[PDB]
């Protein structure tokens, strides 16, 4: 309906508005009037997007000059499509409640693989070759030679769009990615090119994080779109982590082998300007020198270029001209396809980065590999350490950047992890007619022995027996599926092997089916499918996985799937690889971040992220248990999101297994009753 905020009226598709949504709208309006950044935290995956879009539309209607462009960067494609359809529903509601259209355009952006119409490039599953084939089919030289009408296979969507799609605009009508593809195929135009031509004359547009955090494409996709713009990174509780992936690269034997294989072909094509032809030839030997050197670790981000200029005597300046070479020299060479050429581009980017960005980075070499530690595997990592570098460009170009997700419990660490000036410090806890979740921390077992997953007690028989007993007698009270998370794959497999050795895993087997998540994508998908089908009927199942796995965030356990989520010990990231410790030292000497505090923050963030996916929707309910006495400590409970703290009473913070089972039984029995709206 029409919500009347202190200076505006906003239409909302749903007549009923929860108090949390109203408070969130008030806070967001306050932030927009404050013309500053901020961070938000909500406990509901759904209902946030509709409120955000409604308030954005209301603010644009009230202040067209203050806000011109809106960005809703998300994590993956399902989020993009669901927010697109939510925006479509909002626009339909506005049209049905008002009666006249408005000149608002909404489009979704993705990779060229997602948005393409050629049947000769869709079937392949090479994300690094679609762009190369697209560039080969249509480019500046293609347009130049189209004047003579050369008889060669090439894309023709642009050859029609440039003469027919650059004149007619799209003032109204929000289009989804499939809608854009349909429009392009019916008009004979490329969806990507029309999207590029239409972002300038557009109201809202959504895409993924990689189009803003990666500087190589953010500038091209957003340079002078809007000085005064609003961007939001929903579900970005691990944003800093992916920020590291923005400026982290790895080198292996395959990359250098591919480079040495393709440089011969490049030289053969050339002999059919010289400032880089001879420059590139001797670049590989300097980095292959470390291959023959058997050393543990070398750290010299500033002195690496010094070693480069001592071994080969090259100035630092021409490295800065490598990047501009990519758009200049390569287009003269007429590369048939970017395949067997990506390692050269990534090496050039790495050289440019180390020449330019070396103040808050670190070069690491690791002679270690999984199950083949020291045979042949020197891995070079230009690992990033400060998340501010990946976040400065968006903070200096936008006015009200908002970071929101389902788990942002410490609001004082993000503003100091990366350069930020929050003005919000706001948390929201969902409320319903009844308590939909019953978090509890189970400490010592029936033997009055702690079940903490300490490194010195990982192989202890007593804690393994207690975990097995908890999983057994818990599986008989909560039906249709339990999702259990372990610290790591090694610990998980050792624990299940120990359970198999004893006559305890068989007892769990007859209650629920046991499913194990592995690194294989197809195996994980089929295991998830069989778990879902087993939970559909009354058989019930247990899904055992790891907190730091692709299955932790790739799926959401909707109601009746995973009524119970079990955390076996505090999930702590491994301190090896000399990657975590470098970040700890950088945070200590730069941001004055305690190492123990950061480790606890990361562990509790992962635990909350993997435990908060059991509550999707108001009608949904679930159980959340932590099988570690360390969770009972205040410094770790304080790291849980506010919407879980108030439901975690002090009565059950160190209760044993039997009382936890009784609490679970009582909660499920009282939650099985019908409720109202």
């Amino acid at each position: 309906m029409k919500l009347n905020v202190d200076g505006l009226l906003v239409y909302f598709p749903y007549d009923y508005i929860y108090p949390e949504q109203f408070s969130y709208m008030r806070e967001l309006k306050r932030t927009l009037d404050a013309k500053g950044h901020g961070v938000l935290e909500m406990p509901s995956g759904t209902g946030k997007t509709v409120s955000l879009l409604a308030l954005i539309m209301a603010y644009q209607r009230a202040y067209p000059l203050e806000v011109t462009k809106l960005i809703y960067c998300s994590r993956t494609v399902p989020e993009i499509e669901k927010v697109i359809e939510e925006l479509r529903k909002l626009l339909n509601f506005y049209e049905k409640q008002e009666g006249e259209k408005l000149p608002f355009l909404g489009l979704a952006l993705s990779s060229r693989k997602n948005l393409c119409i050629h049947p000769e490039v869709t079937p392949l599953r090479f994300g690094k070759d679609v762009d190369g084939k697209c560039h080969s089919l249509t480019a500046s030289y293609v347009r130049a030679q189209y004047q003579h009408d050369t008889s060669l296979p090439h894309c023709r969507f642009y050859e029609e769009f440039d003469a027919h799609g650059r004149e007619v605009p799209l003032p109204a009508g929000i289009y989804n990615l499939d809608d854009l593809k349909a429009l392009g195929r019916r008009q004979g135009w490329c969806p990507y090119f029309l999207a590029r031509y239409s972002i300038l004359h557009a109201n809202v547009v959504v895409y993924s994080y990689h189009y803003l955090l990666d500087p190589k494409i953010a500038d091209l996709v957003s340079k002078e779109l809007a000085r005064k713009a609003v961007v939001v990174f929903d579900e970005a509780h691990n944003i800093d982590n992916v920020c590291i992936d923005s400026m982290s690269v790895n080198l292996t034997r395959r990359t250098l082998d591919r480079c040495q294989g393709n440089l011969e072909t490049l030289q053969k094509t050339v002999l059919r300007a010289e400032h880089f032809l001879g420059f590139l030839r001797r670049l590989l030997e300097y980095v292959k020198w470390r291959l023959r050197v058997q050393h543990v670790v070398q750290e010299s981000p500033p002195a690496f270029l010094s070693g480069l200029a001592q071994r080969v005597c090259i100035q630092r300046k021409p490295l800065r001209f490598c990047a501009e070479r990519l758009r200049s020299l390569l287009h003269t060479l007429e590369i048939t396809d970017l395949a067997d050429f990506s390692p050269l581009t990534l090496l050039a980017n790495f050289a440019t980065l180390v020449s330019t960005y070396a103040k808050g980075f670190t070069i690491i070499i690791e002679p270690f590999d999984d199950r083949t530690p020291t045979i042949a595997n020197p891995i070079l990592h230009f690992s990033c350490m400060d998340a501010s570098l990946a976040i400065k460009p968006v903070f200096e170009r936008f006015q009200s950047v908002i970071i929101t997700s389902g788990t942002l419990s410490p609001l004082d660490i993000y503003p100091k992890i990366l350069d930020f000036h929050p003005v919000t410090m706001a948390t929201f806890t969902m409320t319903l007619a009844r308590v939909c979740l019953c978090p509890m921390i189970i400490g010592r077992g029936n033997d009055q022995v702690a079940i903490s997953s300490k490194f010195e007690t990982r192989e202890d028989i007593a804690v393994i027996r207690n975990y097995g007993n908890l999983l057994l007698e818990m599986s008989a009270v909560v039906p249709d599926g339990i999702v259990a998370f372990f610290t790591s794959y090694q610990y998980m497999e050792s624990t299940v092997a120990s359970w198999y050795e004893q006559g305890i895993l068989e007892n769990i087997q007859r209650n629920k089916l046991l499913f194990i998540e592995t690194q294989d994508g197809a195996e994980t998908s089929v295991a998830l499918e069989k778990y879902q089908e087993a939970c559909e009927n009354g058989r019930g199942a247990i899904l055992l996985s790891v907190a730091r796995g692709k299955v932790s965030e790739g799926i959401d356990f909707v109601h009746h799937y995973g009524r119970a989520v079990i955390m076996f010990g505090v999930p702590y990231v491994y301190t090896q690889s000399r990657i975590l410790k470098a970040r700890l030292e950088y945070l200590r000497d730069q941001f004055q971040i305690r190492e123990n505090d950061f480790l606890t923050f990361d562990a509790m963030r992962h635990a909350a992220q993997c435990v908060g996916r059991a509550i999707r929707g108001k009608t949904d309910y679930g159980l959340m248990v932590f099988a570690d006495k360390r969770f009972a400590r205040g410094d770790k409970r304080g790291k849980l999101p506010r919407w879980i703290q108030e439901h975690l009473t002090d009565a059950n913070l160190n209760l044993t297994v039997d009382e936890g089972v009784q609490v679970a039984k009582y909660f499920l029995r009282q939650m099985a009753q019908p409720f109202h709206r």
């Binding site: 629920k512 009354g538 099985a672």
Partner: protein, 380 residues
């Protein structure tokens, strides 16, 4: 604003005086206001009914050993099932109850589908001391119930009640195909769980048109069973439903007469105990078979033996008694003696029937509308 934040209610303002002593008369009206506190309907709900072939499925897994309900789930469940059977046969004259027990991934038909109340109670009492082993199998019990109820006539309402204690079931085949088959067969399935809500039970109840409930405590268990006691509503006229049933007269045998022939009861002959060799009992109108209990379907000729008063007890719902016209005593010009109780009419209001135009006091009107269900004047 709020309702209680306005003006304070003064309930004592109702009483008034005009002659310094009239208050008594006012309280007399209060006494007249005291009566007629009912809606003149002992039930006030469903005015008809339909025959039911109900099957009760009882879990026999280890979960029945839980002590949530003292002493354990099985004992309280069987006690409440005996109560439910008694009440169900009390409120349904021509219905039938079958009992299936699920145990060790198998289903055993503990009692055949019949209308005898005593047999089911004895079977439950025998099953009180059963051994709980294995895990329940909803698929087998539902398959057996569907197989037995498939051939029942369409006019009968086919119902299956499942008391699911364990939270897990073993299905030898896909259960959703069985659910679709039940939906095509028009079978109502209702589940009353004990521990927590299960997805399969909810889906089954939703698709088959039944109701799924979860027990909070023993009182809630009894309330759910009582709710299941009530027959489902039936259409005004559905089909050609008629059933051939006899009415055995309870002829006892006395040695004074020469027609005293002792005979063993057919039902008692099937028991392990020595059959009762009584003087007489109920004789089948078709084959003159002797029975001791009613209503019991005849084993020989297949005829159903039903007691006429049980059927006739529900006839007042077919012909409800119309409310009498309330008339003040002053406005009625006639005799001032009640037609029913012969008492003098002194109340402010006199009720007159619309048919026989007889006068009944408040007590007689309430008695006729509540218990008698027939106007004494209209009888003549």
């Amino acid at each position: 604003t709020k309702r209680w934040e306005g003006g304070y209610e003064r309930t004592w303002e109702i009483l008034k005086e005009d002659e310094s002593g009239s208050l008594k008369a006012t309280i007399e009206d209060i006494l007249f206001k005291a009566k007629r506190k009912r809606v003149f309907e002992h039930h006030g709900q469903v005015r008809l009914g339909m025959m039911r072939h109900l099957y009760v499925v009882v879990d026999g897994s280890r979960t029945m050993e839980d002590q949530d309900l003292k002493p354990n789930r099985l004992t309280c469940t069987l006690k409440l099932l005996e109560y439910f059977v008694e009440e169900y046969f009390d409120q349904n004259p021509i219905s039938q109850i079958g009992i299936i027990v699920t145990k060790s991934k198998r289903a055993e038909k503990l009692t055949e589908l019949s209308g005898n109340p005593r047999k089911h109670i004895t079977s439950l009492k025998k099953a009180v001391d059963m051994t709980c082993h294995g895990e329940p199998s909803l698929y087998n019990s539902l398959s057996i119930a569907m197989q037995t109820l498939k051939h029942m006539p369409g006019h009968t309402s086919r119902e299956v009640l499942i008391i699911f204690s364990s939270l897990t079931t073993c299905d030898p085949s896909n259960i959703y195909d069985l659910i679709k088959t039940l939906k095509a067969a028009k079978i109502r399935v209702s589940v009353i769980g004990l521990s927590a809500e299960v997805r399969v039970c909810t889906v089954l109840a939703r698709e088959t048109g039944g109701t799924y409930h979860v027990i909070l405590d023993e009182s809630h268990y009894k309330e759910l069973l009582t709710h299941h006691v009530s027959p489902p509503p039936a259409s005004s006229s559905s089909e050609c439903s008629l059933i051939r049933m006899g009415f055995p007269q309870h002829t006892i045998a006395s040695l004074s007469d020469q027609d005293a022939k002792p005979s063993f009861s057919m039902a008692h002959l099937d028991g392990n105990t020595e059959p009762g060799l009584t003087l007489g009992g109920y004789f089948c109108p078709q084959c003159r078979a002797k029975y001791c209990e009613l209503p019991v379907e005849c084993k020989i000729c297949g005829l159903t033996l039903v007691s006429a008063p049980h059927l006739a007890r529900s006839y007042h719902h077919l012909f409800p008694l119309d409310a009498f016209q309330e008339i003040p005593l002053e406005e009625y010009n006639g005799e001032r003696f009640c037609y029913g109780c012969q008492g003098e009419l002194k109340d402010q209001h006199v009720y007159v029937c619309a048919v026989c135009q007889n006068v009944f006091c408040v007590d007689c009107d309430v008695f006729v509308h509540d218990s008698l269900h027939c106007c004494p004047g209209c009888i003549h």
